[PDB]
UniProtKB/Swiss-Prot annotation, chain B:
Its EC number is 5.3.3.1. It comes from the Bacteria. It holds the Pfam family SnoaL_2. Changing W92A: Slightly reduces activity. Reduces protein stability. Gene3D superfamilies: 3.10.450.50. GO terms for biological process: steroid metabolic process. SUPFAM superfamilies: NTF2-like. It catalyses: a 3-oxo-Delta(5)-steroid = a 3-oxo-Delta(4)-steroid. This is Steroid Delta-isomerase. The gene is ksi.
Length: 126, 128
């Protein structure tokens, strides 16, 4: 599996791609049989077409920005967790959402599972 | 209480950090379900049940000199789960150290911690 140091780099790269809005590059980071639970508690999304559609819905408009708010925490079994903030629009107003993603990677360095922890308690209107 | 709401998860997980910070091992253990599992660090074998969990915390905190604080808000779900970032400050090998951690917790229908997973490794340790 990817080393702890490699997990930190991969998870940081993911946030960079979200921040620039490169949907195709994001989808390429995922394994074929990957699942996305975003927000955690909702049914998993699976399939590359479905994951692409998910990121199109969220990022296609542009005007989404994302940045790490602390270091990536990485394990020795190919997993990590990271805190970040998303800037977006809600009800036509600028808002911020605080999120933690948990990721497991496969032996090819691709995302096998992603779980995103957030709810309305993590939303701020600006 | 019942299965915690997102707000309640935020309060429970914040109280957990306060208990680590003060080092009240028996109060920490009470927050766990009787048959809870802890994986700390994630990737190592799970610890099962309050006796083992108490032994684990007494090894980690019984020496005193540990301080913990949240470094950002608790993230909570609507199915009794949450995740939080925090920093632990300790003294080791004659050096003040800091460890950055994220804990993920799942709560049961009585408001007790059913599972805890702690994400960290040596890449998250800073010595002085
Ligand atoms: Cl942090
Ligand atoms: Cl944060
Ligand atoms: Mg039970």
């Amino acid at each position: 599996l990817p080393t702890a140091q490699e997990v930190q780099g991969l998870m940081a790269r993911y946030i960079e791609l979200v921040d620039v809005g490169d949907i195709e590059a994001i989808v390429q980071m995922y394994a074929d049989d990957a699942t996305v639970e975003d927000p955690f508690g909702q049914p998993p999304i699976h399939g590359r077409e479905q994951i692409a559609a998910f990121y199109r819905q969220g990022l296609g408009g542009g005007k989404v920005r994302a940045c790490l708010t602390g270091p990536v925490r990485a394990s020795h079994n190919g997993c990590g967790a990271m805190p970040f903030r998303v800037e977006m629009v809600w009800n036509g107003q600028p808002c911020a959402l605080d999120v933690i993603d948990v990721m497991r990677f496969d032996e090819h360095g691709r995302i096998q599972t992603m779980q995103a922890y957030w709810s309305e308690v993590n939303l701020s209107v600006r």
